[PDB]
Design a protein around this ligand. Structure first.
Ligand SMILES: Nc1ncnc2c1ncn2[C@@H]1O[C@H](COP(=O)(O)OP(=O)(O)NP(=O)(O)O)[C@@H](O)[C@H]1O
Ligand SMILES: Nc1ncnc2c1ncn2[C@@H]1O[C@H](COP(=O)(O)OP(=O)(O)NP(=O)(O)O)[C@@H](O)[C@H]1O
Ligand code: FES
Ligand SMILES: [K+]
Ligand SMILES: [K+]
Ligand SMILES: [Mg+2]
Ligand SMILES: [Mg+2]
Lengths: 121, 614, 612
């Protein structure tokens, strides 16, 4: 019995009042792939499908499997899972890289900025 | 804590009765005149609509028997001395019975009976505005006494009088000398005297009823002088008419570079015309829809529903639709399925029109793109469905390395002419084409034999990440591709790298050696470079390094690195300054600098303490 | 010319009759059910408002009688199998005559008649919602038939059954077993069966009338659990339910750093509460969850903007019993009362922020670096001057005469300024370290006049648009320099002529200023802030250049090196002067995308180091 402790960052934009919070996931290493990407897929199909990740070739060619672990940016489908029982993996997204990709910035009040320019010019 | 008092114990015990619905006329008048219309100036719009409806009814009546058609005009009269505004029309008019049944009954419109009596619903059904029956009572908003002179167009009708103060009681009488048609005199309220002036009435009419089907005269002078060119076929309207209409609608003195005349009926009756300004967009265009609705040739004045997608706000024009649902205030019914389908149809039609224009002409569309690219970029960013994403992305034009300078290329043709065995599209961001051709990332990518698009405008890679896909082909930047993909002596290189990492341990988290670079001594690579560049603009150096991990990647073959190899011992301080400077240069080349003012001082120090030996 | 057909020749000879205005009910019902309410979901909101009005009337009658108060609550029943929604209240109820008078007459409301019998207009006028008389008929938007079982609260009234198919005809009958109050049965339409689902009904009720003054139960479960805290006195309400109310209204789980409770009646009745989040604002924020209320029911304007656009970082609720409303229970667009309410709210919020700054320096400083961009945007978008100074009173800057870490406002900056000076100087740099070492600050360092240091973006444009504060102008350091009135003269003349020859396209004018000690070069333009921000506009988007002047430092060693290095390496000299110009442009902030300078810098570094 080799229970692996995974600490995965989670943030659901659609959740009501979601705030950054920490969760711990326990996955047995005897029935899971050594690679980090296998553990993410395992919880998606069995434990919880809320977590979203991008994987296409599970080999290291598309680069969609690259995230940060222990403060270091790595690749899940290449780097394996640490076998230390006492040590817990720090599963984090890319350094900050939050939902900004889907925040849809507005940048409103743009004309009023110009309206404040021509009196000086 | 789950208790309810709902039960079905109730049942009928006596004989059922029967009743008819009633209506409190006084409260209905108060509601119409006080809490129905946001703007107090819509009463003349309603009266002009009624006059147009009456004139259309008279025209239909005189065409049914095929007799002569007399003059048909709507006259606005302003009497500042008496504080009254007079509306007169030469339409059908109304008899005593018609005056009592129509004017005296709330929510009773003679247009509905007229429409039901058409037996065709194809000639005047599209030219009658009145559908509720409360438009006339909007005059009571500003009038303490309404006087109506009406006589029918029948051969032998008598003039009639109609007075009402809006207090739920109206008195009728017989009048003499009244011209055929209907004349309504409005005695303005004490606080509503602004409508007894030329300028205010002219402004409101130009806001609402420029495009009525009949000539409109204000104080004796015609003020329309412009027909609605969005009604007839596109072949029947000339280029001069298009230019004049664009000048009117856009409030600009230039000409429209693109003209679209959309007239569809299978999804819904739409008569819409759109223009693209010749001049570059202004800051008002990029700030929130510049398209005016016109149901039965009268303004709807939504200004908030955004019948057109926000990114398409750069175009100017009008949209005609007789099927849009209007509330009692003659305003668009918010959150309507019909208006949403209208918006979708207009968006897809405009996308198809832009694609067809791009196919037809190359230089004109290139100018249009270099003028209005930010709007399509915002549309790609703000889109949700992948279908509209691809439709808007079909409008993009990016010049690539496989083509000479000044030759913009589309995404579709790039995908068509590239390798069919790889689902990858490569794009590079640089201020200029020359910079892109000499960018360190492009040079590192030169090992691969593939074509790469070049992006110059801001918020371009942002749209590339939002699109994320095109024709089942992924969008990968050059920096992301090279970071994902995996002179000096060996020991000398190792000690040099160790020294640089020692003096850049906090700022740089990893340094590697790459032989792909040829003209750049160093290069900073981040996995999500496109996302990181935009993230930096919204969120000193230590924090940025921690949240970015600027993984350095130097080129030993560069002469600068070779010089630093021996400067590390003779001038350790100058070597530290130079390694800081090259790190800053690589960061700038990556676009990962929020403000380059900080490095100016250390660059000046390096310059003064470096070339002093000359 | 003029073609006029208006004439006064008409005359009246016939007898003047007299008629009463009529109103056909078929078209009125059609208009209400089709072309009155934009949202199909407002019918239960109207029914809940009617139930609340009935319960308020019963409460008023009972307190007038001064007897025991039985339980009063609103019950909502949803039956998916039957496709029906049932709303029941324990209010006064309606007799057969009352049912005919109210239900059967359009625009006839018993609420107005009850209010006319109040004679105080304060006991229940602030809680009665019904004012038009068409709220019930909104139920016909989704119902092909409506059953109403209402029994009056009078001791002896009989229950009555009310039927109406919405076709302009309704029938009434005697009903047995009906409990005191009013029970309404709605049979949903074929295409509007989504209202027979518990989830949708619960969501829309929480959207509209979850602040109803009386308990509301849907399918036996109450979801109010939270009184409308904006009605009670600020001293009565405590911070714990302030946090709860914030967490509900803002849809967040943090605490509000600021809580403002506004309750005034002299200009207009306002019962509003505002909050400021602890967390930094999200880019989505950059009606802001400050949706207006009236008699404890939602209005969802989103168009009048009762609260200023820049004041969108605050969350809360605004209540006003005197706001005009549409027939569809929506705000009158561009209403004078709405505009005056917005102005009053903005003034009160500005005063509250000023008071918070006065009573807590460090908390307000944290708030300013948390929400400064909103005040900057407010200054930029403002039109009235007094609004500009009112918002500018909220600005916090750190000056050159104070240590790092503390910030000051413009008012207390001008308070300590010299009497002779009548202008305010501000310098823009990313950090205070750069600002103290900025060449413009060093050039102005000759005088002892204090200068403010602003670091955040848009500070240049904000100060330019402000342009005045307490009758004192705002002049940037670069503007003051440009408006102000070892390299011997001959060699200096030859060397600036060299720049003029080799930088004529870029540098229009070259001059020597003796006010530089550490920076070899300076770039100064008249519209420094305006040009700097307009260049960012132009580079950000290709839409609808400038006159740069470069000044060299005679005593700088780098500049002095040109005298001996021009005669040795002309090409290296040209490259070095180009790099000096680029560095001066970067320091001025007028530089374009600096990716182009990297190649020139690398070439200069590799070429100029062939001596060690
Ligand atoms: N100037 C007029 N000349 C002739 N008939 C008129 C005139 N004004 C009103 N009417 C008639 O009186 C009816 C009542 O006026 P109105 O309230 O405007 O109804 P409507 O215009 O048909 N519907 P609405 O969209 O609310 O205006 C109209 O439907 C016409 O039949
Ligand atoms: N559940 C009820 N119990 C008792 N009286 C009711 C109930 N529902 C409606 N009424 C009465 O019937 C009248 C007609 O309803 P309604 O159309 O809502 O008028 P209103 O609510 O007073 N004005 P409005 O704001 O348009 O709803 C109300 O004014 C009440 O007097
Ligand atoms: S799945 Fe393709 S890089 Fe890992
Ligand atoms: K009417
Ligand atoms: K009623
Ligand atoms: Mg009309
Ligand atoms: Mg009501």
């Amino acid at each position: 019995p080799r229970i692996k402790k995974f600490a995965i960052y989670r943030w659901d934009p659609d959740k009501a009042g979601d705030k950054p919070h920490m969760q711990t996931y326990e996955v047995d290493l005897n029935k899971c792939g050594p690679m980090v990407l296998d553990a993410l897929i395992k919880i998606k199909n069995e434990v919880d499908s809320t977590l979203t990740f991008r994987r296409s070739c599970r080999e290291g060619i598309c680069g969609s499997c690259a995230m940060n672990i222990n403060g270091g940016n790595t690749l899940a489908c290449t780097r394996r899972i640490d076998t230390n029982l006492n040590k817990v993996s720090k599963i984090y997204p890319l350094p900050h890289m939050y939902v900004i990709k889907d925040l849809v910035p507005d940048l409103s009040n743009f004309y009023a900025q110009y309206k404040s320019i021509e009196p000086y010019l | 804590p789950l208790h309810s008092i709902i039960s079905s114990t109730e049942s009928v015990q006596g004989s059922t009765s029967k009743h008819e619905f009633q209506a409190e006329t006084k409260k209905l008048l108060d509601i119409v005149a006080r809490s129905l219309y946001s703007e107090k100036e819509v009463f003349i719009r309603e009266l002009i609509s009624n006059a147009s409806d009456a004139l259309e009814k008279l025209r239909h009546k005189l065409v049914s028997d095929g007799q002569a058609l007399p003059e048909m005009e709507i006259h606005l009269q302003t009497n500042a001395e008496k504080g009254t505004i007079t509306i007169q029309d030469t339409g059908i008019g109304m008899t005593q019975e018609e005056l009592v049944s129509n004017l005296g009954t709330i929510a009773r419109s003679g247009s509905k009976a007229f429409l039901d009596a058409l037996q065709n619903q194809a000639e005047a059904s599209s030219k009658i505005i009145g559908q509720f029956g409360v438009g006339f009572y909007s005059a009571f908003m500003v009038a303490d006494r309404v006087e109506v002179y009406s006589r029918s167009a029948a051969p032998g009708s008598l003039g009639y009088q109609w007075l009402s103060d809006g207090s739920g009681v109206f008195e009728i009488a017989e009048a003499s000398g009244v011209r055929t048609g209907t004349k309504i005199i409005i005695h303005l309220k004490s606080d509503c005297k602004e409508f007894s002036s030329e300028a205010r009435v002219r402004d409101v009419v130009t806001k609402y009823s420029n495009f009525v089907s009949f000539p409109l005269y204000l104080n004796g002078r015609r003020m329309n002088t412009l027909q609605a060119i969005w009604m007839m076929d596109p072949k029947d309207v000339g280029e001069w008419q298009h230019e004049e209409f664009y000048r009117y609608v856009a409030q600009a003195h230039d000409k429209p570079r693109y003209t679209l005349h959309y007239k569809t009926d299978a999804p819904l009756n739409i008569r819409s015309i759109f223009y693209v300004p010749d001049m570059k967009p202004s800051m008002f265009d990029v700030s929130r829809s510049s398209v005016a609705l016109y149901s039965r040739k009268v303004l709807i004045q939504t200004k908030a529903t955004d019948i057109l997608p926000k990114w398409l706000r750069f175009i100017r024009g009008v949209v005609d639709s007789e099927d849009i649902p209007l509330n009692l205030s003659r305003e668009l019914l918010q959150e309507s399925a019909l208006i949403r389908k209208l918006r979708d149809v207009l968006q897809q039609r405009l996308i198809k029109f832009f694609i067809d224009q791009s196919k037809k002409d190359a230089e004109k569309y290139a100018k249009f793109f270099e003028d209005y690219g930010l709007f399509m970029r915002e549309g790609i960013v703000t889109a949700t469905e992948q279908e509209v994403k691809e439709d808007i992305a079909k409008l993009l034009r990016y010049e690539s390395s496989a083509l000479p300078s000044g030759q913009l290329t589309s995404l579709s043709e790039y995908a068509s002419r590239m390798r069919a065995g790889t689902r990858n599209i490569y794009y590079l961001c640089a201020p200029n084409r020359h910079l892109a051709e000499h960018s360190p990332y492009y040079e590192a990518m030169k090992k691969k034999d593939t074509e790469v698009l070049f992006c110059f405008e801001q918020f371009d890679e942002l749209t590339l990440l939002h699109l994320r896909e095109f024709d089942k082909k992924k969008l990968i930047s050059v920096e992301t591709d090279i970071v994902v993909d995996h002179c000096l002596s060996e020991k000398e290189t190792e000690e040099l790298m160790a020294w640089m990492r020692n003096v850049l341990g906090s700022r740089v988290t990893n340094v590697k050696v790459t032989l792909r670079l040829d003209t750049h001594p160093a290069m900073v690579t981040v996995l999500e470079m496109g996302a990181a560049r935009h993230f930096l603009r919204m969120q000193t150096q230590e924090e940025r390094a921690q949240l970015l991990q600027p993984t350095l990647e130097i080129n030993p073959r560069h002469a600068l690195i070779k010089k630093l190899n021996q400067l590390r011992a003779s001038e350790p301080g100058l070597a530290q300054l130079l390694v800081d400077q090259i790190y800053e240069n690589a960061m700038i080349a990556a676009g990962l600098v929020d403000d380059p003012r900080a490095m100016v001082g250390r660059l000046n120090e390096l310059l003064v303490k470096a070339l002093e030996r000359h």
